[PDB]
Amino acid sequence: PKTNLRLWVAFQMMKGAGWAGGVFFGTLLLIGFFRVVGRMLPIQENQAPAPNITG
Amino acid sequence: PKTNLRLWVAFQMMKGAGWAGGVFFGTLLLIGFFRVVGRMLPIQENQAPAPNITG
Amino acid sequence: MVGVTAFGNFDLASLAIYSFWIFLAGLIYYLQTENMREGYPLENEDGTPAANQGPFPLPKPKTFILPHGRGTLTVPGPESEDRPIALARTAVSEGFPHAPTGDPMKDGVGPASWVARRDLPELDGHGHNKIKPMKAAAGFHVSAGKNPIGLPVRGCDLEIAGKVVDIWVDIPEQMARFLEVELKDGSTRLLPMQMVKVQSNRVHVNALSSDLFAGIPTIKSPTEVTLLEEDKICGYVAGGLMYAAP
Amino acid sequence: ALLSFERKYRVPGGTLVGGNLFDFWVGPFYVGFFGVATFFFAALGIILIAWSAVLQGTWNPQLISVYPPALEYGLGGAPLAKGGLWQIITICATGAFVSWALREVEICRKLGIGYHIPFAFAFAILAYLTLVLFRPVMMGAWGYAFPYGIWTHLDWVSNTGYTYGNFHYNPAHMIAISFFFTNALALALHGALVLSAANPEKGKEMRTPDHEDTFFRDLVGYSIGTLGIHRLGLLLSLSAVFFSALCMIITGTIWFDQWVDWWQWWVKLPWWANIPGGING
Amino acid sequence: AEYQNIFSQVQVRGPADLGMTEDVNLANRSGVGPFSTLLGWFGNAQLGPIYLGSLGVLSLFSGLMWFFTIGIWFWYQAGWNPAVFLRDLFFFSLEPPAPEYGLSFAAPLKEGGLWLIASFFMFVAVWSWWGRTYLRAQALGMGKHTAWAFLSAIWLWMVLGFIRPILMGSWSEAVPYGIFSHLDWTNNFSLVHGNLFYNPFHGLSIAFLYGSALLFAMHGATILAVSRFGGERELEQIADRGTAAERAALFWRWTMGFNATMEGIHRWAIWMAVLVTLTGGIGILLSGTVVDNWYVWGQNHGMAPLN
Amino acid sequence: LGYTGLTDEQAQELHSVYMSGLWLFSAVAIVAHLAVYIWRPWF
Amino acid sequence: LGYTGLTDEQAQELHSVYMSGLWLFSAVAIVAHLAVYIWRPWF
Amino acid sequence: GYTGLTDEQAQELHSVYMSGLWLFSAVAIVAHLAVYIWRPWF
Amino acid sequence: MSKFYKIWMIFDPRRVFVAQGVFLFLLAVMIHLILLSTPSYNWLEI
Amino acid sequence: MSKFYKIWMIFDPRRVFVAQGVFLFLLAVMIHLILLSTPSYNWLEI
Amino acid sequence: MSKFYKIWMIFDPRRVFVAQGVFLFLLAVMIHLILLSTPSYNWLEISAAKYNRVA
Amino acid sequence: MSKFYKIWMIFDPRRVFVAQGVFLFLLAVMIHLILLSTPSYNWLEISAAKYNRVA
Amino acid sequence: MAYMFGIIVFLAMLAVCWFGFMAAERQAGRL
Amino acid sequence: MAYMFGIIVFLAMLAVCWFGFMAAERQAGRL
Amino acid sequence: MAYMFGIIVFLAMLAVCWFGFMAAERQAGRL
Ligand SMILES: CCCCCCCCCCCCCC(=O)OC[C@H](COP(=O)(O)OCC(O)COP(=O)(O)OC[C@@H](COC(=O)CCCCCCCCCCCCC)OC(=O)CCCCCCCCCCCCC)OC(=O)CCCCCCCCCCCCC
Ligand code: BCL
Ligand SMILES: CC[C@H]1c2cc3[nH]c4c(c3C)C(=O)[C@H](C(=O)OC)c4c3nc(cc4[nH]c(cc(n2)[C@@H]1C)c(C(C)=O)c4C)[C@@H](C)[C@@H]3CCC(=O)OC/C=C(\C)CCC[C@H](C)CCC[C@H](C)CCCC(C)C
Ligand SMILES: CC[C@H]1c2cc3[nH]c4c(c3C)C(=O)[C@H](C(=O)OC)c4c3nc(cc4[nH]c(cc(n2)[C@@H]1C)c(C(C)=O)c4C)[C@@H](C)[C@@H]3CCC(=O)OC/C=C(\C)CCC[C@H](C)CCC[C@H](C)CCCC(C)C
Ligand SMILES: CCCCCCCCCCCCCCCC(=O)OC[C@H](CO[C@H]1O[C@H](CS(=O)(=O)O)[C@@H](O)[C@H](O)[C@H]1O)OC(=O)CCCCCCCCCCCCCCC
Ligand SMILES: COC(C)(C)CCC/C(C)=C/C=C/C(C)=C/C=C/C(C)=C/C=C/C=C(C)/C=C/C=C(\C)CC/C=C(\C)CCC=C(C)C
Ligand SMILES: COC(C)(C)CCC/C(C)=C/C=C/C(C)=C/C=C/C(C)=C/C=C/C=C(C)/C=C/C=C(\C)CC/C=C(\C)CCC=C(C)C
Ligand SMILES: COC(C)(C)CCC/C(C)=C/C=C/C(C)=C/C=C/C(C)=C/C=C/C=C(C)/C=C/C=C(\C)CC/C=C(\C)CCC=C(C)C
Ligand SMILES: COC(C)(C)CCC/C(C)=C/C=C/C(C)=C/C=C/C(C)=C/C=C/C=C(C)/C=C/C=C(\C)CC/C=C(\C)CCC=C(C)C
Ligand SMILES: COC(C)(C)CCC/C(C)=C/C=C/C(C)=C/C=C/C(C)=C/C=C/C=C(C)/C=C/C=C(\C)CC/C=C(\C)CCC=C(C)C
Ligand SMILES: COC(C)(C)CCC/C(C)=C/C=C/C(C)=C/C=C/C(C)=C/C=C/C=C(C)/C=C/C=C(\C)CC/C=C(\C)CCC=C(C)C
Ligand SMILES: COC(C)(C)CCC/C(C)=C/C=C/C(C)=C/C=C/C(C)=C/C=C\C=C(C)\C=C\C=C(/C)CC/C=C(\C)CCC=C(C)C
Ligand SMILES: [Fe+3]
């Protein structure tokens, strides 16, 4: 039946987009971990001067 | 194959959520039409007093 | 010398840096042409000389003189495959893969490939067989680590293929180089030591299912292994990572 | 065109994504799914650098410099001319480097070799991401990342270092340097020893690895062996980059002062802090 | 997860291995040392034997006297106190003569005389080790690549401690013997010469130093990746190319479009490492003698923006 | 040609399945763009 | 002459479908340029 | 020859190549002329 | 159209659809990030 | 779990999955609207 | 021009269409990013200034 | 000048056409970027001034 | 006014999608 | 006046795409 | 600190999902 072919194309695309979404959100949680550790540390007190002349 | 059964359950749920999505976004566009016509009319000039004592 | 220029901003540090760019361009040309002593001239997929040979020329031949009377090697030189290759084109255009025409594990193509190396043992500096079964070198013993001899050998299918009956050692390098596995017909095979995991109660061979161990190319002498035999064995086992199906 | 031995290896398969859709070569270069991804990000990142040169108003390649957002932009987006191009080029660099590692994994599979090369390259990627991503995110601003410019990224190294005094006193930076110098020593020795055996005195036969073992034992009383030296060169290189990343992730996040002041913890150990004489007494 | 061949699974120990004879004067070679099971996990277990002979004794005695001369100065700076010696170990420093003494050997023992005495023993130790590295290769009929590679490191070391002090006209330009003090010297050198980052030969020297970590990572990972084919036995792959050498070549050709050979990758290796200290030594030799401010030199040569 | 080994009729069938989803996906996108353009137009 | 294995009639077939896509894609693009020029001309 | 093209294969392929060259340059000349009308560079 | 369906005789649809899923997701993420980088459309700055 | 699978012998799965798709979508919309009604989470007020 | 179809006798369409696909996407993305880099043509800022948003 | 067709006896057209494609693209990109760097010719900034599109 | 012209443009786009979707169900209704 | 003339040029370009497309379809029937 | 305790709670929840998902592939692996 044609419907099984409709769902097979959807399944192939969701394989692709699912993996791409897994890497995107997995990266975003790694960035999140470094942001959480940045919040725990005394950085806003001791905030460093800008190293670039653009500021 | 078990995968065809996985996709059939997904298809049944996407039938449901697709119809529920169509009425939600279709309502939101109907509200949008009345908002667009509200923007065209001189209403902000002639804005009516509040009819309720709560304001 | 500070501030002294011959012309423009060209001081003695300018002379240095420009001289280096000339030296570096010369050195890179020397290095690349040295690296064309194997695998050149370039070929078409049919085996004819490619019309494009690239920008660097072949270097002049050098001759290596081999120890233990094994003659001399000149490189670059005539460099045929010297064996059949069981591959067929999958496209008329160049740049596509060539599919195995039969069983690639046994035909020895792709990751199962092997080279027509010399059919003699590799020798040590004295001229003895470099690699030997450990029973044939009386001073040797397993001095640390889990001794594998007597362990069952498991395939990636999780079934037992055989048991370890000896270690083949590199004598000058004093290192374990193969495990000898006795199969369920009592004929043995060599496994490359880098392809096996010596677990606490087993040797696990993640490249092979337990049936594929009989296909391992067998050595002709039970006391030595030739460089040709090594390549056939090592190639065959590594080919299993692609070609061993579940 | 092929190497004379190459044909027997150009078989199908080993691809991680895309099957045979991209399983072909372009000259010498293998393509595959991640080769398409690699070239796109590489070309986009390069072209956005050339466009940044137009906005900057120089064509001298040594003055071209793409600066990150100023600290006022935090970790948010900046205008393209004023830090937003740097952010996209950083995405393209990350996309290119990761795709390149994954393309190497596919080539390893097709040749049946170990995965050591893409694994080693992943250490360089993590050192890059430490400097452009993890540490700026910890410190709360993209402006703590370095600018993409041949000499201007050395200004970032200088200005970042001297924020903490002499940066030689960072103890993990000292360990990283020790691996970097020791790696370069070992590469000189390994290259020379192999060449000295394959290229002996004129008329002599090729030397054996027994002569290689013998030379170093005669020289220094030890010889790591053919397998040991390649393990060592790998681990020295990877250790150098691990301790490099470590020295920076701590700098400006858990240590803020002059790094030279750290070493007083040893001087001020109470069993000897007060003993007169020496340099510190 | 599979086996990565980074540590050995099984150690075997044969007899002690005495090594090749060739023209080695075997009376000068010691007995074999003990085996180390710890080293056997990563490389060879056997320690020794070692060859001594004439340049050996000269080098080891002068090197001992160099080390001993510094040590006694550190014990003196500690005031003979064994606790202060361990507290301040990284802070002690045998400094070169002060600038007013120029190159004259007239500086007092506490004001730089012991630094000249220490530096003389270092000079003899290092140069006699170079000749030892040449002659050990000669006795085995090997190429002199290792001695010529070592000469490139000696070039930088000679520039730092000998040649540039002479060309600058004082021993005060030389490096002090001390852990933190040679680091303070390295930092001060860059500040006096106006940011050494803008020295182009320091830039080159770093390119080859990074390239050496790049290239040894690539080569070490490559040989381990093909070690399942006996690719670590590189001389037999040079003499009789196996599948290990071909798979290694095709990995890099398919990756980056060109490749080395088993012999030719070790030429890339030796030059990448040699060029670190060759270009380095030039970059230091130019500093102060030809350029006293590298940042301003950078501005005039189109690599820094003008003011 | 015929590199994939699909027949011409298999290709005609599949292309319609694909194209039907293309117009559906883009129709949903237009609705989302129309919603955004009512709330916060970009022209 | 043929490096690809396509016969001449196969190459004409493929090219005529290829050119249909090129003209279609370039027609869509001209309408986008027309709309943008009407909105904000660059000459 | 190195390519293995026969003389007639080379002369055929050149004739079509020349057609693309003249087409591509003809478009470019219109583009230059338009920009010279719009904003002369001499 | 006429013959655009012949693309499925050049490129294997199974592989194309998986690759097109990756493309469309990354394109969507890209455009959301372009907007999030722009002050007048950064919905996550509340 | 044990025997929770017996629910598919009480209620026809075809109909349940369509009805569950409607539920989960409306639940999601409800929670987004609850947040949009709250000042500290109204992401559409830019 | 009537022989330009012979390009498909020189080059295999499987590689050509991949190359062209990356080329056209790359070219399009750079032109959009160039315009967004330009204050006269950044449409998201033109609309912000038009509608008195944050500019 | 009539024997210029013998170029294809020396150089394989597949290499020439790919090389030519790359070269002509990068040359065109080079010239467009040079003009966008040139204020008297940057068409985007010219039209910005012509229509008073900023300030 | 001339803003709502854009609202009509989106509806024109959505009519093209309808015509395309039904055509896709026609040009291979096995037809 | 490059506004009006611009419109005309774009409408002229589209007529060449119409010619070429119909020409391609006039080829594509195995002409 | 006692905020990041919540980050761990989500990871505990995500381990329950893994244990449940694999169990669902076990308790009817036709098994
Ligand atoms: C800041 C310091 C950095 C510093 C950067 C690092 C410097 C230190 C490292 C130095 C490494 C030297 C590299 C080397 O030895 O090259 C020779 C070798 C020989 O290969 P071959 O196989 O024996 O012969 C060539 C040919 O037979 C290969 O097969 P085929 O012909 O079928 O396909 C061609 C290849 C690539 O070939 C080319 O691109 C043309 C030749 C390039 C020679 C480069 C050196 C000499 C000319 C330099 C000035 C050329 C001026 C035009 O595959 C393809 O073309 C397929 C398409 C993909 C490639 C697209 C490239 C687009 C154009 C980009 C610009 C490329 C410019 C070279 O390999 C090649 O020819 C291809 C190399 C491709 C990667 C090179 C990367 C190294 C940097 C650039 C080259 C070295 C000069 C700096
Ligand atoms: C504030 C500090 C300055 C600075 C000041 C200097 C100075 C000053 C010098 C360098 C030099 C070097 N710098 Mg710098 N440098 C800075 C920033 C950097 C950065 C960075 C990321 O910021 C990096 C990566 C580098 C990198 C490097 C190297 C490429 C180079 C040293 C090569 C080498 O092998 O030396 C190590 C090798 C040797 C010293 C050779 C030793 C050989 C001798 C023969 C060994 C004898 C051993 C002895 C007898 C003991 C035996 C014991 C045994 C057990 C028996 N610099 C900044 C700008 N740099 C050097 C150079 O060449 O500059 C061009 C140099 O002189
Ligand atoms: C971890 C140990 C060392 C290491 C290892 C290593 N590097 C590796 C490998 C390994 C094992 C590879 O397999 C891989 C390779 O293929 O080598 C030939 C690679 C490689 N190491 C490289 C370089 C490199 N490695 C370095 C360092 C090191 N590499 C470590 C010290 C350094 C420096 C500065 O220390 C550099 C420059 C490349 C030759 C190659 C990776 C090639 C690659 O990623 O290709 C795809 C991308 C492109 C072709 C271009 C991308 C363009 C960008 C999108 C735009 C530019 C953005 C960039 C941030 C601008 C920077 C400007 C600078 C002036 C600051
Ligand atoms: C090309 C650039 C690189 C390079 C190359 C290089 N170095 C080299 C070589 C090469 C090719 C050698 O052949 C040579 C060597 O032999 O290596 C093993 C060497 C070498 N590189 C060395 C070091 C070194 N290289 C460095 C760097 C570099 N080397 C660069 C990265 C560095 C640094 C700081 O980066 C250092 C520290 C040595 C290991 C060695 C040179 C050895 C030497 O000259 O020693 C002189 C001193 C002695 C012989 C003895 C000192 C005192 C000991 C305590 C012995 C005491 C014995 C006594 C009998 C005891 C009695 C006690 C009583 C109380 C009983
Ligand atoms: C169905 C899915 C439903 C999803 C629902 C929506 C989820 C949205 C939230 C996502 C949660 C995680 C976000 C990350 C952590 C966080 O809160 O960050 C919020 C901060 C804002 O901090 C701000 O605040 C910071 C302080 S603070 O953290 O608030 O205390 C401050 O330090 C900073 O300056 C300031 O900008 O922003 C970031 O950390 C930046 C994210 C950057 C991502 C893109 C990077 C592009 C730039 C170049 C680098 C490229 C790297 C490429 C790598 C492949
Ligand atoms: C720098 O540039 C900016 C970021 C500023 C802007 C980006 C600029 C730019 C270059 C954008 C380019 C965009 C392009 C080229 C987009 C192309 C998109 C395409 C071609 C999309 C096609 C999608 C097709 C789909 C989704 C087809 C699906 C078919 C299916 C699933 C089969 C049929 C099945 C169904 C209808 C039912 C599905 C099943 C269920 C259960 C609902
Ligand atoms: C800053 O610099 C600037 C950006 C300003 C530089 C600008 C200057 C510059 C270099 C621009 C360059 C532009 C170029 C080169 C543009 C070229 C575009 C092209 C070549 C477009 C072509 C499009 C073609 C298409 C969409 C083709 C589609 C084909 C289709 C749909 C059919 C596919 C095939 C089949 C169905 C199979 C057919 C039959 C059989 C039997 C298999
Ligand atoms: C009907 O037939 C079709 C039209 C579907 C196909 C026709 C035939 C054919 C084979 C065409 C081929 C076309 C090709 C090869 C096109 C290639 C396009 C490419 C390479 C597009 C790349 C896009 C990349 C994007 C949008 C990247 C986005 C990245 C973002 C937003 C950063 C955040 C994402 C992540 C953290 C996840 C990814 C990982 C990293 C490290 C970035
Ligand atoms: C008004 O103001 C306040 C809200 C503040 C106060 C409200 C005060 C108030 C009146 C509260 C009242 C609360 C009540 C009455 C709560 C009662 C809750 C109950 C009765 C909950 C029961 C839950 C039962 C469950 C979840 C059962 C699940 C059963 C399952 C999953 C199995 C389903 C069946 C099968 C699988 C088939 C089994 C076998 C075969 C052979 C077919
Ligand atoms: C594991 O358990 C199974 C899945 C197997 C089921 C077990 C057996 C079984 C049959 C359970 C049955 C449970 C029932 C009957 C639950 C019923 C729940 C209901 C009635 C939930 C209603 C939720 C309503 C919500 C969230 C409404 C949201 C509305 C919003 C957000 C406004 C926007 C909505 C619209 C524009 C459309 C609203 C509707 C209309 C008609 C205008
Ligand atoms: C550096 O400063 C500035 C950039 C400002 C100025 C100076 C820059 C400078 C030095 C520029 C130099 C430019 C040059 C050298 C330009 C050269 C251009 C050429 C030679 C262009 C050639 C174009 C050729 C084309 C487009 C040919 C196309 C051919 C086609 C389409 C047909 C191909 C043939 C077939 C399909 C037939 C196949 C035959 C058979 C039998 C199968
Ligand atoms: C436990 O206590 C004991 C006393 C037993 C042992 C204590 C051992 C100890 C604590 C030793 C400490 C050693 C240290 C910390 C050494 C540090 C050395 C460093 C970091 C050296 C760095 C650089 C040195 C260089 C560049 C030297 C170059 C020298 C050259 C090129 C020699 C040039 C020669 C002269 C200037 C002398 C000329 C003289 C005449 C007569 C011509
Ligand atoms: Fe090696």
Residue numbers in the entry:
A (entry chain X), B (entry chain x): 15 to 69
C (entry chain H): 1 to 246
D (entry chain L): 1 to 281
E (entry chain M): 1 to 307
F (entry chain BA), G (entry chain BB): 7 to 49
H (entry chain BC): 8 to 49
I (entry chain AA), J (entry chain aa): 1 to 46
K (entry chain AB), L (entry chain AC): 1 to 55
From the publication, what sentences describe this entry?
The dimeric reaction centre light-harvesting 1 (RC-LH1) core complex of Rhodobacter sphaeroides converts absorbed light energy to a charge separation, and then it reduces a quinone electron and proton acceptor to a quinol.
Here, we report the structure of the dimeric RC-LH1 complex, determined by cryogenic electron microscopy (cryo-EM), at a resolution of 2.9 Å. The dimeric RC-LH1 complex was purified from a LH2-deficient strain of Rba. sphaeroides harbouring a crtD mutation, in which methoxy-neurosporene is the major carotenoid. Here, we focus on those interactions that determine dimerisation. As Figure 3B shows, the two opposing PufX polypeptides, labelled X and X’, are tilted towards each other so although their transmembrane regions are distant from one another their respective N-terminal regions are brought together, starting with residues 17–25. The precise fit at the dimer interface, enabled by PufX and protein-Z, by C-terminal interactions between opposing LH1 αβ subunits, and by a series of interactions with a bound sulfoquinovosyl diacylglycerol lipid, bring together each monomer creating an S-shaped array of 28 bacteriochlorophylls. The detailed structure of the dimer interface shows that the BChls of the two LH1 rings are brought together so precisely that they form a continuous, excitonically coupled chain of pigments, allowing ultrafast migration of energy between the two halves of the complex.
